[PDB]
Amino acid sequence: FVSLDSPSYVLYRDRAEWADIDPVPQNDGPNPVVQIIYSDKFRDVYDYFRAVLQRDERSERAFKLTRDAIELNAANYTVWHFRRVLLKSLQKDLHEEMNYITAIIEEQPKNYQVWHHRRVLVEWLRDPSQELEFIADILNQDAKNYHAWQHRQWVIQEFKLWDNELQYVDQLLKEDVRNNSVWNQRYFVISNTTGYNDRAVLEREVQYTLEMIKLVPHNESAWNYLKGILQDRGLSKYPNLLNQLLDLQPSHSSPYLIAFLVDIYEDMLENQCDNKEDILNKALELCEILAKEKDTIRKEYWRYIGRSLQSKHST
Amino acid sequence: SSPVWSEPLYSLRPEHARERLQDDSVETVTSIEQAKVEEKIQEVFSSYKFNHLVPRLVLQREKHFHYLKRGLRQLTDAYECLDASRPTLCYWILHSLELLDEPIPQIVATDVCQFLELCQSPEGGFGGGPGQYPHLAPTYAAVNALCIIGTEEAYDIINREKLLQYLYSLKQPDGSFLMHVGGEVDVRSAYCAASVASLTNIITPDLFEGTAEWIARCQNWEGGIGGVPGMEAHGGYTFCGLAALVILKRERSLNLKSLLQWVTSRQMRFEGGFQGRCNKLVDGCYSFWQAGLLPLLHRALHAQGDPALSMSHWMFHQQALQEYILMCCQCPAGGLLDKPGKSRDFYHTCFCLSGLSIAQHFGSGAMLHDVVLGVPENALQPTHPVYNIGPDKVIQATTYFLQKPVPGFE
Amino acid sequence: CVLS
Ligand SMILES: OC[C@H]1O[C@@](CO)(O[C@H]2O[C@H](CO)[C@@H](O)[C@H](O)[C@H]2O)[C@@H](O)[C@@H]1O
Ligand SMILES: *C/C=C(\C)CC/C=C(\C)CC/C=C(\C)CCC=C(C)C
Ligand SMILES: [Zn+2]
């Protein structure tokens, strides 16, 4: 009806239709700590929320009240919980509620409660038809909104909407190839569809990622994805990769490349590679280079790697 | 070496300029935002250098103390958005004072006790404020706050029998926990649950059945941990997950190698602080979420008999982190923050300090090695990496509660 | 930066 900011808004203590119920003040005790100096409007609504909650009044008036409590503080999970109780008790139109939550989320996209609420609504209606489009809009405003991506993964997995996600992924990666949330979604979509065991899929991915690395050599995301899809099997299992990288090093000796090389050597030494002494030596030289010059912020990490390599493969 | 009145800084070395972003001439929103911050941070850094004269850095303890002391009692309406997180505001502020080694007047302590008592639900746990349903976030905060106070009065306020029942009413069959009845699920809940359960000594064999397995499923291809299986690696959720498994003595369920390499890569080569996710901006509050992971990893690896572990340092740039917090994260008026240009708040104040303390103190076995950058007074009180409250406070509380039986169980 |  009327919003907290509308010119015609009226405090609840002044509403005739609310006269029959006494407001319940919040009991902070005689000597309050972390006491918030609420605005008159804020306290007004909460004093009445407290009342309806205490009485467990499943009414249309209470339902409208929660809407105001939520606008005052959308992070109040108690209100949200009660609101859902009312949605059921009153048998409210869930599609109407979806429109509501849609607006709420647009205003406050980084709130835990709002997203959880929308997930409950989609569960109740078993209707995801609006999900991907909605989420895409949120992501269009903040491509890395965590709650947004989490919700999207849930919808896709729960309702099996995989068909167009890889395309979505490419779209966003074109917009910002530094978007780590998008590289993650990529792994999410592939590992859940074709999987990475299909060697044709793996190669496509390795190619794609190498191509992105060449386009933007200092984009850590691509490098992490490359190591991510090959690590389980073992970096040393892909001999051509080492060669390719060694060829690019003289021209792209970024800390990412040098680091990847140590990662490979590590795995090689772990799998009884040939020329163990030679591999260890190149690995230690790189660790020193990363610690003293190319990646000094991680000097301690590298020094550790150096010592680990020695304790594991010196002989 | 240098005179005592001048102390060379890592962030001011001429070669430190090389650490500036290389966008490969390919700009996207990400590089553009990163470059902007770097531009501002370089300016800040430069303001602390006067050619070869580099005055000692100073943590403004008094300004911080006065900001905190005020908030502990009263807060403007700007905090209306945290009305469902007051016990959390309590913990943030008290831990900050604790870290700053500023004593808590007996009167204030008793008032806080009463307040938290008013927030306790009859069904167990604590809510965001009096009359609010219980929630693990504030429950976690309320127990830590009571343990920071450490009096038997504080300890006894917790209704342990109902607290255990409450944890049970949030346990899911897949090993996870709801944050509150009918609420959302993610790794924060496993860490809240385990934190309060182990401190108050209310852990049953089945309480955490399947939880370690569930947390492991949260570590991803990046090596870090996401909020839920499949999601992006994130400093906050990663701290939650590891510390939870450390409590459950199940750290081994994770690939510690990928996790270590992930977290160390999260410290910004230029800023000196930590980002929460790869390719995102630096933020003072991760100083704890991220850097705090190192001590947990050190402990986990040390228990495995790792011969290559350091006996004097955490595997991150302790000095660099201290330079970011001290030169970029302090509000002149008191309190700490995200980064230059942001406004202060008790959340950032609590965590910037928590990280600064981890960055200054190393401990492992009988080995202790401090690195307090700047004036000696900067030294903060140590903090427990799992619970992030005084180590002394953790020992006192666990000892106390170990003396009570697990509610209705043998 | 909301935790909850
Ligand atoms: O850091 C990788 C590491 O994490 C584990 C879980 O501890 O698995 C994660 O990463 C895999 C890709 O590396 C994914 O297939 C899996 O779903 C995700 O949980 C370990 O198996 C792995 O060594
Ligand atoms: C900019 C900071 C952001 C977005 C938050 C990231 C941190 C997270 C998710 C940590 C959450 C921790 C929890 C719920 C347990 C700790 C609870 C309290 C300190 C009250
Ligand atoms: Zn922050």
What is the distance in angstroms between the CA of the first residue and the CA of the last residue of chain C?
9
B285 CB neighbours in chain C (<8 A) are 1
Domain residue limits at A67:
1-315
> Considering just the CA atoms, what is the radius of gyration of chain B in Å?
21
Chain B CB within 8 Å of residue A39 CB: yes
Chain B CB within 8 Å of residue A118 CB: no
With 0-12 / 13-18 / 19 or more C-beta atoms within 10 angstroms meaning exposed / middle / buried, residue B357 is buried
Method for this entry = X-ray
Query: With contact defined as beta carbons under 8 Å apart, do B203 and B233 qualify?
Result: no
Query: With contact defined as beta carbons under 8 Å apart, do B355 and B321 qualify?
Result: yes
Query: With contact defined as beta carbons under 8 Å apart, do B209 and B222 qualify?
Result: no
B283 catalytic, yes or no?
yes
Count CA atoms closer than 13 A to A131's CA, side-chain side: 28
Helix axis angle for A131-141 and A94-107, nearest 10°, is 10
According to the annotation, is B201 in a ligand binding site?
A: no
B111 with A33: Cβ contact below 8 A: yes
Gaps in chain A (C to N distance exceeding 2.5 A) after: none
B345 catalytic, yes or no?
yes
Tell me the residue length of chain B.
410
Residue of chain A nearest B30, judged by CA positions? A178
DSSP B255-315: -HHHHHHHHHTTB-TTTSSBBSSTTS-B-TTHHHHTTTHHHHHHHHHHHTT-TT--SS--S
Most informative mutation of B221, B238, B242 for ligand 1 (most atoms within 8 A of CB): B221
Instruction: Looking at the complex, report in whole angstroms how far the Cα of residue B255 sits from the nearest Cα belonging to chain C.
Output: 26
Identify the H or E element spanning B72: helix B61-73
The Å distance, Cα B15 to ligand 1 centre, comes to 37
C4 with A75: Cβ contact below 8 A: yes
A175 CB neighbours in chain B (<8 A) are 28
Query: With contact defined as beta carbons under 8 Å apart, do B141 and B88 qualify?
Result: yes
Ordered alpha helix ranges (H), chain A: 40-55, 60-72, 77-89, 94-107, 112-125, 131-141, 146-159, 165-175, 180-192, 199-215, 220-230, 239-248, 255-270, 276-289, 299-313
Count CA atoms closer than 13 A to B182's CA, side-chain side: 16
According to the annotation, is B348 in a ligand binding site?
A: yes
Identify the H or E element spanning B367: strand B367-370
How far apart CA A215 and CA B31 sit, in angstroms, is 14
Chain C CB within 8 Å of residue B348 CB: yes
Catalytic residue ranges of A: 110
With 0-12 / 13-18 / 19 or more C-beta atoms within 10 angstroms meaning exposed / middle / buried, residue B192 is buried
Tell me which residue of B235, B225, B312 sits closest to B266, measured CA to CA: B235
Spell out a b/e string for B245-271, using b for 16 or more CB atoms within 10 Å of the CB, else e.
bbbbebbebbebebbbbbbbbbbbbbb
Tell me which residue of B237, B24, B258 sits closest to A227, measured CA to CA: B258
Query: With contact defined as beta carbons under 8 Å apart, do A51 and A62 qualify?
Result: no
B23 catalytic, yes or no?
no
**Torsion-angle region of A169 (φ positive above 0: left; ψ -120 to 50: alpha; else: beta):** alpha
Q: Measured from the CB, is residue B253 less than 6 Å from ligand 1?
A: no
DSSP-derived pairing of the beta strands B74-75 and A35-36: parallel
Strand partners, A2: none
Identify the H or E element spanning B363: strand B361-364
| Resolution, angstroms, 1 dp | 3.0
Tell me which residue of A129, A135, A78, A149 sits closest to A105, measured CA to CA: A135
How far apart CA B322 and CA B372 sit, in angstroms, is 8
Domain total in chain A: 1
Give the one of B31, B82, B84 whose C-beta lies nearest to A78's C-beta.
B84
Alpha-carbon torsion (B202, B207, B209, B215), positive or negative: negative
Alpha-carbon torsion (B386, B388, B392, B394), positive or negative: negative
Catalytic member of B286, B324, B347, B400: B286
How far apart CA A168 and CA B115 sit, in angstroms, is 50
How far apart CA B11 and CA B13 sit, in angstroms, is 6
According to the annotation, is B286 in a ligand binding site?
A: yes
A112 CB neighbours in chain C (<8 A) are 2, 4
Residue whose token pair is 């990490």: A301
Most informative mutation of B255, B257, B259, B263 for ligand 1 (most atoms within 8 A of CB): B255
How far apart CA B407 and CA B387 sit, in angstroms, is 22
What is the distance in angstroms between the CA of the first residue and the CA of the last residue of chain A?
79
The Å distance, Cα B30 to ligand 3 centre, comes to 18
What is the distance in angstroms between the CA of the first residue and the CA of the last residue of chain B?
62
Residue of chain A nearest B110, judged by CA positions? A31
Q: Which positions in chain C have a beta carbon within 8 angstroms of at least one beta carbon in chain A?
A: 2, 4
CATH (domain of A177): 1.25.40.120
Domains and CATH numbers, chain B: 1-410 (1.50.10.20)
